[PDB]
Design a protein around this ligand. Structure first.
Ligand SMILES: O=P(O)(O)OC[C@H]1O[C@H](O)[C@H](O)[C@@H](O)[C@@H]1O
Ligand SMILES: [Zn+2]
Length: 566
């Protein structure tokens, strides 16, 4: 009862804010996707969570921290609610004015970016480990986003690591109890303070759904998905965070039947499976697609910034192609009608399918390294409209994070506009722009020094001029290098971003490391319409054999088959 909680709050009196001593850890360096460790790091190690959170607060200036608003939310994995409560008490003791938290701690990463930008927050804390499994024996992470809605840049994370390495005390309001399940405002009387502390529990879906309603034509979506002659879709949230979004948006508001969603209840362990959308970890989805009923399938990851796009009977549209089709039919979306195409971008290991659409029009295309920093740098400079990564990433400049459900609704808008099947659209695209046959082999969790030695010896073997011009079977080595990127907005230089083997026919073999994990990307272009409709595994097989033979991956890793194939 709300009245009982109010009376309790009144009788307890003001809540003291207290300083507690702590000892610093040494591995709290937040990388590209924040700080991710095993769950027991945050659940069992003393003050680990408090140390990192307090470091995040200290990385914010005091004038930026006093009275400001901070968004807090996560993907609903195990231990998220407890950590969120700790964040609420610490934030109460650290001068934060207001915390906007999604109901029950549920808030997808794109929803966090959107809310941050909407309410003019100083930033947000996202409790997610992305596609990594959850549970007491799973993983756990913390991302910090700044006032532009995007991930904190390297300077902020550097300050967080440096602060966390020497921190000796933190502040907390240990008697603050907050109910995450009831929407509305909860205020707390703080001791020795005159303003109360505010916690606003908002609907996890409302603001994000309003944003998408502004992005797309929900009338066309409604006519496409809700009719008796509806387009049969099957959306697999993988027990992740997009489930509630899938129902409130696709099912309720747009009229798709409730049978269209599956694995759409957020589970604290993601139902035992890895919340990673690909052909391996989402095999159940692709095998129900193999049956016959549905024309469109899609899968999401843990925090909702990734998507897998499937056609009828299991037809697979690889992400490198997905972003290119979206770019080729980009004006089927009202948002880009209002916006215009400011630029295209893709990560280097992503196939050059988008490049063909960029060159067909006259739109600048930026080949960035793996990561968000470069995409956000281009977006803030009004030079990037649509971007995509082979790691099942697709997004626009509407927010400062990638967005899986947004990409799905974009594919539904393109299907509604073109009135064709997914496979037919992909075939027409291949016949218009040529096909970029693409594959990626994931060799997960190998011995570290063996992989590093493979990359060093392979690198030295590549840099020799005895390598350039050698004919492999037939292909001819044109260039081999270690990818370097010069950022066109802040002059930053990123080196060692992937070993590249570019051939004279435009094909590429790329090696990268994510410990550790070996990632092998193969991209070969075909312009003849007679050859663009063959099994890519069969078309790329010579280049795969060249990659394994030149790298000697088997003889140094002992692996005879990749863990995942894309
Ligand atoms: O291959 P990795 O180093 O593990 O990075 C793979 C992916 O990690 C994150 O999800 C980033 O948001 C992506 O930009 C990146 O493609
Ligand atoms: Zn993710």
């Amino acid at each position: 009862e709300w009245i009982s909680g109010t009376y309790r709050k009144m009788e307890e009196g003001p809540l003291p804010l207290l300083t507690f001593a702590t000892a610093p850890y040494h591995d709290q360096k937040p990388g590209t996707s924040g700080l991710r460790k095993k769950t027991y790091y945050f659940e069992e190690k003393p003050c680990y969570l408090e140390n990192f959170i307090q470091s995040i607060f200290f990385s914010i200036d005091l004038k930026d921290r006093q009275g400001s608003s901070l968004v807090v939310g996560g993907d609903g994995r195990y231990f998220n609610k407890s950590a969120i409560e700790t964040i609420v008490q610490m934030a109460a003791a650290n001068g934060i004015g207001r915390l906007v938290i999604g109901q029950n701690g549920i808030l997808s990463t794109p929803a966090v970016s959107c809310i941050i930008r909407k309410i003019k927050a100083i930033g947000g804390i996202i409790l997610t480990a992305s596609h990594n499994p959850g549970g007491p024996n799973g993983d756990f992470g913390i991302k910090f986003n700044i006032s532009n809605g995007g991930p904190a840049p390297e300077a902020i994370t550097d300050k967080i690591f440096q602060i966390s390495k020497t921190i000796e005390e933190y502040a907390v309001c240990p008697d603050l109890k907050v109910d995450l399940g009831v929407l509305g405002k909860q205020q707390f009387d703080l001791e020795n303070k005159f303003k109360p502390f505010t916690v606003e529990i908002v609907d996890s879906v409302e603001a994000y759904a309003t944003m998408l309603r502004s992005i797309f034509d929900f009338s066309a979506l409604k006519e496409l998905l809700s009719g008796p002659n509806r387009l049969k879709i099957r959306i697999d949230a993988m027990h992740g965070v997009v489930g509630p979004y899938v129902k409130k948006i696709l099912c309720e508001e747009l009229g798709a039947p409730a049978n269209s969603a599956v694995n759409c209840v957020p589970l604290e362990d993601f139902g035992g499976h890895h919340p990673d959308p690909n052909l391996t970890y989402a095999a159940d989805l692709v095998e129900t697609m193999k049956s016959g009923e549905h024309d469109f399938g899609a899968a999401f990851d843990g925090d909702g910034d990734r998507n897998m796009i499937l056609g009828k009977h299991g037809f697979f549209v690889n992400p490198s192609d997905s972003v290119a089709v979206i770019a080729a039919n980009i004006f089927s979306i009202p948002y880009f009608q209002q916006t215009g195409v400011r630029g295209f971008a893709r990560s280097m290991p992503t196939s050059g399918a988008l490049d063909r659409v960029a060159s067909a029009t006259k739109i600048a295309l930026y080949e960035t390294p793996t990561g968000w920093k470069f995409f956000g740098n281009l977006m803030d400079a009004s030079k990037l409209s649509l971007c995509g990564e082979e790691s099942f990433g697709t997004g626009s400049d509407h927010i400062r994070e990638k967005d899986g459900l947004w990409a799905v609704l974009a594919w539904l808008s393109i299907l509604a506009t073109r009135k064709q099947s997914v496979e037919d659209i992909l075939k027409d695209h291949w016949q218009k722009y040529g096909r970029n046959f693409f594959t990626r082999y994931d060799y997960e969790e190998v011995e570290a020094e063996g992989a590093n030695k493979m990359m060093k010896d392979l690198e030295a073997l590549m840099f020799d001029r005895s390598f350039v011009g050698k004919q492999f079977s037939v292909y001819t080595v044109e260039k081999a290098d270690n990818f370097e990127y010069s950022d066109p907005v802040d002059g930053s230089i990123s080196r060692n971003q992937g070993l590249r083997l570019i051939f004279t026919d435009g094909s590429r073999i790329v090696f990268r490391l994510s410990g550790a994990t070996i990632r092998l990307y193969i991209d070969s272009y075909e312009k003849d319409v007679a050859k663009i409709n063959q099994d890519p595994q069969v078309m790329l097989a010579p280049l795969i054999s060249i990659a394994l033979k030149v790298s000697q991956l088997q003889e140094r890793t002992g692996r005879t088959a990749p863990t995942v194939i894309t």
